[PDB]
Amino acid sequence: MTPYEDLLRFVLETGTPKSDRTGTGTRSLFGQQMRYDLSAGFPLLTTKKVHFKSVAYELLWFLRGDSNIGWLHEHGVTIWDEWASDTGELGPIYGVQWRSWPAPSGEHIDQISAALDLLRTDPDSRRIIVSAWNVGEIERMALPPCHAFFQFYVADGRLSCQLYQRSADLFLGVPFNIASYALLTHMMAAQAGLSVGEFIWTGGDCHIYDNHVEQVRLQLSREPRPYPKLLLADRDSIFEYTYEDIVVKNYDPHPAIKAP
Amino acid sequence: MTPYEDLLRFVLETGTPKSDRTGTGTRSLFGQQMRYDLSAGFPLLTTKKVHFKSVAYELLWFLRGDSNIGWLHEHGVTIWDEWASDTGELGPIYGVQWRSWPAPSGEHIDQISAALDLLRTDPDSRRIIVSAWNVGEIERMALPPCHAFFQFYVADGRLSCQLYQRSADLFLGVPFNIASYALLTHMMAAQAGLSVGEFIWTGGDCHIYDNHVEQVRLQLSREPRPYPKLLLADRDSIFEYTYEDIVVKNYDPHPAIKAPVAV
Ligand SMILES: CN1c2c(nc(N)[nH]c2=O)NC[C@@H]1CNc1ccc(C(=O)N[C@@H](CCC(=O)O)C(=O)O)cc1
Ligand SMILES: CN1c2c(nc(N)[nH]c2=O)NC[C@@H]1CNc1ccc(C(=O)N[C@@H](CCC(=O)O)C(=O)O)cc1
Ligand SMILES: O=c1[nH]c(=O)n([C@H]2C[C@H](O)[C@@H](COP(=O)(O)O)O2)cc1F
Ligand SMILES: O=c1[nH]c(=O)n([C@H]2C[C@H](O)[C@@H](COP(=O)(O)O)O2)cc1F
């Protein structure tokens, strides 16, 4: 019922102290897994109000294959401002690798299209994968991919997705990541003629920053309300979805909780 | 604990019947995780005999950046034979991505060396990653990487390793993969002056081929025995290890179980 919350606790209590770079004292565990049944409800956390608008616009940004934060500002989103050059450039990050990974043939590979094609023509493939982790381009990126790698799986006409996040800011980061991929999974499924199955979150370094220990103590004290429902409009193509094509119904979150 | 055997039993008992590339059949589950505390023993399975010589030579071959089976034959190992071209070539697989992943500028990136570095120099880093999944080059490979990529993690002078394995032949392949990465981890740990921690195995498509089922049942009827210990001789470079340096102690498995591979 509350995969995320259980993991947050377990890291607050069992987590090992550790410095990062840069920041303060994180408590940390390695190799942790959360599991969501997407048919049961959309995993937008109810123990704290999550800024879904930012989540959606960011994913649409990723899907546009966009490297600049311009289109993001146009819609009043600023979560990326702090790493963007004077020009607003971030380098060949997520969207760039997703939509146009630079092969050695000079070709650009659209992994999203390729994945979706597989889903439609060869649902049983074990190669339905997208990787943002481009070793050749990590050092051109403002920041190396955090949610680095993901895979899809079909079973009884139900689409599952497992994500691998190498580094996980549990309190401020992961909530976004859960909703984000949850949304993506609804979109691929919708485009491919499938239903939603599971979302599997697999983390590398799972960490609660030093500041956030208080922000987090509160959030664990709150009782979890029933999950909201995700709705989508019809579109001929994943790349045609707009923010206006998305609705989150019956979302009743406990009040927000700020933190740097 | 017997995490391998539990997963195997679990997939057998609850897996979904599925079709596949190899034209055989499968029971399958998605997103499963095995965990091993490497300080309690080297996870060379004991409910069947696993041929360590092969696991070890395959590993040393990856480390050489080698994609031709010739060196493996030089040492009697034949497990990659039915995928190689007539010249023994497999394409830019595993090691070639580990030692020399070709960047857009052309340059070969040595990820294994990069990783050691980060371990010796910045153990807390969350970017200690080696990837075989070169989107750019997968078509060029005889097969796409099953053990697709891995991360290292340090805490209290203990080295942990998590592998993501996109596709898991539970009976035939996984026992090889568990041992191999456990071995690499000991290696990376020796070279960074660290002790071993956990090996965490995370699978995408976890499957038991339909022609492996009588073997899986035999194996599951057996009583698990304590894991052996691994002894590594000293070397000054991960790239200088030899089989001679890699010794197992107290490994008493139940008998080996033969099984037909799915091409
Ligand atoms: C995800 N990323 C990230 C990071 N650095 C850290 N420590 N954690 C992260 O999740 N560097 C790059 C990147 C940029 N993405 C983000 C996403 C959300 C917020 C955040 O502040 N969310 C608030 C809502 C405020 C926002 O809508 O403007 C929240 O409590 O959810 C910051 C950076
Ligand atoms: C892992 N790989 C693999 C694959 N194809 C399939 N269907 N499954 C796999 O695991 N293609 C490439 C590769 C080669 N690795 C292997 C590893 C072990 C065996 C096998 O036959 N093991 C037997 C005998 C051990 C020794 O004699 O080789 C055993 O029961 O372990 C075959 C190919
Ligand atoms: O998808 C986001 N979620 C995640 O939490 N990271 C966090 C992890 C880490 O705390 C920081 C990246 O720094 P590092 O490269 O050291 O892991 O951003 C950022 C991504 F964009
Ligand atoms: O890491 C090794 N073991 C792993 O289990 N695969 C197996 C899994 C799979 O059944 C087969 C390749 O099938 P596919 O490419 O269709 O996923 O190789 C092979 C690798 F070399």
UniProtKB/Swiss-Prot annotation, chain A:
DUMP binds at residues 21, 126-127, 166-169, 177, 207-209. Its EC number is 2.1.1.45. Changing residue 202 to A: Appears to be functional by complementation study. Induction: Is expressed under the exponential phase of growth, and down-regulated upon reaching the stationary phase or under both oxidative and nitrosative stress. Expression of thyA is significantly increased within murine macrophages or under acid stress. Is expressed at a higher level than thyX under all of the in vitro and in vivo growth conditions tested. It is found in: Cytoplasm. GO terms for molecular function: thymidylate synthase activity. PANTHER family: THYMIDYLATE SYNTHASE, THYMIDYLATE SYNTHASE 1. This is Thymidylate synthase ThyA. It comes from Mycobacterium tuberculosis (strain ATCC 25618 / H37Rv). The lineage of its organism: Bacteria, Bacillati, Actinomycetota, Actinomycetes, Mycobacteriales. The gene is thyA.
